[PDB]
Amino acid sequence: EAPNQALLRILKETEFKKIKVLGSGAFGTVYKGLWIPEGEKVKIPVAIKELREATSPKANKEILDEAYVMASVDNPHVCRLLGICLTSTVQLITQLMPFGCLLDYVREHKDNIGSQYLLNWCVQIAKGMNYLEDRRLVHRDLAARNVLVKTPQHVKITDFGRAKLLGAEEVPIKWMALESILHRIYTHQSDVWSYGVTVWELMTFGSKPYDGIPASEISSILEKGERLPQPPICTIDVYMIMVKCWMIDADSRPKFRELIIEFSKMARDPQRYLVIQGDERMHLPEDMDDVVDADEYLI
Ligand SMILES: *CCC(=O)Nc1ccc(CN(C(=O)Nc2c(Cl)c(OC)cc(OC)c2Cl)c2cc(Nc3ccc(N4CCN(C)CC4)cc3)ncn2)cc1
Known about the structure:
Layout: E1 16-24, E2 28-35, E3 44-51, H1 57-71, E4 81-86, E5 90-95, H2 102-108, H3 115-134, E6 137-138, E7 147-151, E8 154-157, E9 164-165, H4 178-183, H5 188-203, H6 215-224, H7 236-245, H8 256-266
The structure holds the ligand *CCC(=O)Nc1ccc(CN(C(=O)Nc2c(Cl)c(OC)cc(OC)c2Cl)c2cc(Nc3ccc(N4CCN(C)CC4)cc3)ncn2)cc1.
The ligand *CCC(=O)Nc1ccc(CN(C(=O)Nc2c(Cl)c(OC)cc(OC)c2Cl)c2cc(Nc3ccc(N4CCN(C)CC4)cc3)ncn2)cc1 binds at residues 22-23, 30, 47, 49, 63, 66, 79, 92, 94, 96-98, 100-101, 103-104, 145, 148, 158-159, 161.
PDB class: transferase
Assembly: monomeric
Name: Epidermal growth factor receptor
């Protein structure tokens, strides 16, 4: 019933300079790059995604209707759209997240990740999801891979390719609630499950969930009542929370609002809840003169 008032911005190819490739695909390629508004006299670090010059007519809509979604969100913990460019290929411009994949990050720095950092991440992702909740929105594919590191302190949620309005009608599996796997049913509560799994990924420094098992069986497994194991670093209090997420009755599952709160609690005495060897001996980090961050651009 509410009207989507989101502004969608068109940019000119001359306002942005592609610098280097971050990802490549049959679908297209994504560039680390910069964008300079014509008036603005500010440089903004962007990720530019450009569909391959050959364009699939079905394919093109595919990305627009993603940009439609991104455009509709404004949040600290949600990767916002900067704009799009109607070049012969259509180019999509979002905010650059320099450290990239959270999944990768924790794999690359498993030795260096503070207990506090993880708890911080957990919250932040909960703040993210509780926002998508508020905006009546269901991510439908939450995973460690789909969270992006702007800076170690800050992460933002991403890849709402599958996002749908709650109750709307129209496969990781491992991250997907049981309700979903049998019934293709999705809810915020369904997302809470995939949140649980996400936390597990982090608390195991980026380990594969259910490693070994073909995704086929999982459905049965969960009926039996089995879930993932408690990670080594995890106190029962943290694990206990993850488990709550994995209940079959989704009304028993916690609310992203609650999770924010509970991890926020634990955020304050990190070492009370995560045991990491040498916790307090760990720390994580051409002409960038006029450069500014997107989060700092709000016309
Ligand atoms: C670990 C899995 C992974 O790398 N996922 C992943 C990698 C790279 C990108 C590129 N980015 C991106 O696609 N953003 C983006 C865009 Cl452009 C659109 O347009 C539709 C939509 C959505 O959401 C659907 C998203 Cl997320 C991207 C990346 C970054 N930062 C970034 C920096 C570096 C790296 N990187 C990869 C790993 N090597 C080792 C180091 C460099 C990755 C990402 N910021 C903004 N967009 C997307 C997803």
